[PDB]
Amino acid sequence: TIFEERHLKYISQLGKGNFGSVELCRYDPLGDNTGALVAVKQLQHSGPDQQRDFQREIQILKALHSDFIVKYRGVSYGPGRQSLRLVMEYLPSGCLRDFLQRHRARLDASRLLLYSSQICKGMEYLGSRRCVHRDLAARNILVESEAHVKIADFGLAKLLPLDKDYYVVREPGQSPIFWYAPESLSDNIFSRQSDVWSFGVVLYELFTYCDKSCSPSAEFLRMMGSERDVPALSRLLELLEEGQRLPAPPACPAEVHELMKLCWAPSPQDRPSFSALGPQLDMLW
Numbered sequence: 001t002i003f004e005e006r007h008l009k010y011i012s013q014l015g016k017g018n019f020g021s022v023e024l025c026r027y028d029p030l031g032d033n034t035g036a037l038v039a040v041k042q043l044q045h046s047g048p049d050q051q052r053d054f055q056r057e058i059q060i061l062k063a064l065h066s067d068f069i070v071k072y073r074g075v076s077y078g079p080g081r082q083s084l085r086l087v088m089e090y091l092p093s094g095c096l097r098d099f100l101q102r103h104r105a106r107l108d109a110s111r112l113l114l115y116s117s118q119i120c121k122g123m124e125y126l127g128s129r130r131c132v133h134r135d136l137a138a139r140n141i142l143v144e145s146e147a148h149v150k151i152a153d154f155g156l157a158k159l160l161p162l163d164k165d166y167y168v169v170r171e172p173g174q175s176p177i178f179w180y181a182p183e184s185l186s187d188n189i190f191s192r193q194s195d196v197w198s199f200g201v202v203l204y205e206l207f208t209y210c211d212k213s214c215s216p217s218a219e220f221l222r223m224m225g226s227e228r229d230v231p232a233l234s235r236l237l238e239l240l241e242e243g244q245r246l247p248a249p250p251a252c253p254a255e256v257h258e259l260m261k262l263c264w265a266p267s268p269q270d271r272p273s274f275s276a277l278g279p280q281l282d283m284l285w
């Protein structure tokens with residue numbers, strides 16, 4: 001729960017989220033290379049605002065206890081106060097984006113639906129804690145095992161106040177635009193309902209086994225086209241407002257495609273809840 005910095009032996013970089021990376025370290029207090037492997041998150045950039053974002057992330061993940069959410073291990077203690085690190089569990093399989101591509105051939109529709117059902121359960125639990133993820137994508141999901149997935153990357157996660165159902169992010173966005181809901185794209189309005197939009201994109205990613213040629217970017221870029229003096233985001237928004245949607249992935253079962261269409265409902269209120277999606281996915285298997 002408190003990891004001494006001197007005992008955290010650096011191995012390699014796992015990911016590069018902006019303002020701070022995630023590294024693979026071994027917790028080696030005996031110094032003999034026999035200790036357990038862990039994932040350590042730290043800020044790289046500096047400008048007290050990101051430090052408050054990092055402390056928020058820690059507090060958020062610390063108060064989360066689900067089989068479908070990446071496990072918090074503790075924090076790091078060293079010759080500080082620069083800069084404190086978030087210690088989490090390491091999932092040797094890595095992100096589901098890479099796993100889907102490495103094992104296309106062995107993952108059938110029931111397995112994809114099992115992952116979908118699990119991501120869903122984890123999203124239900126995030127909603128129940130008033131947490132909005134803002135970064136649901138296959139790249140931010142980890143494989144614990146052949147039949148077990150977990151949600152991760154809580155760097156953009158915000159807690160909803162008790163009086164509100166949405167969060168208006170002042171920023172704006174620095175993630176690929178193909179996962180955002182139309183209301184986040186136009187007014188930066190994030191909520192549980194915008195996480196449901198993104199979930200439909202995660203359903204699309206799973207059922208295209210994260211193939212790069214029919215990926216959310218690749219397919220939206222082809223159906224968007226090339227305008228004269230209109231920015232890419234505005235064109236995507238014109239496309240979504242017109243009711244155009246990503247098209248059903250090759251060999252995708254009809255039921256799953258209809259489910260993605262529900263997740264992509266134009267207005268947030270018409271999008272099903274994660275608790276509504278849950279039994280639907282279980283029924284399909």
Ligand SMILES: C[C@]1(F)CCC[C@H]1Nc1c(C(N)=O)cnn2cccc12
Pocket residue numbers: 014015016017022039070088089090091092093094095139140141142152153
């Ligand atoms: C899902 C990510 F956070 C996105 C980029 C780094 C990923 N993090 C990882 C984490 C973690 N606790 O965050 C844990 N295991 N792991 C194996 C490969 C990558 C990651």
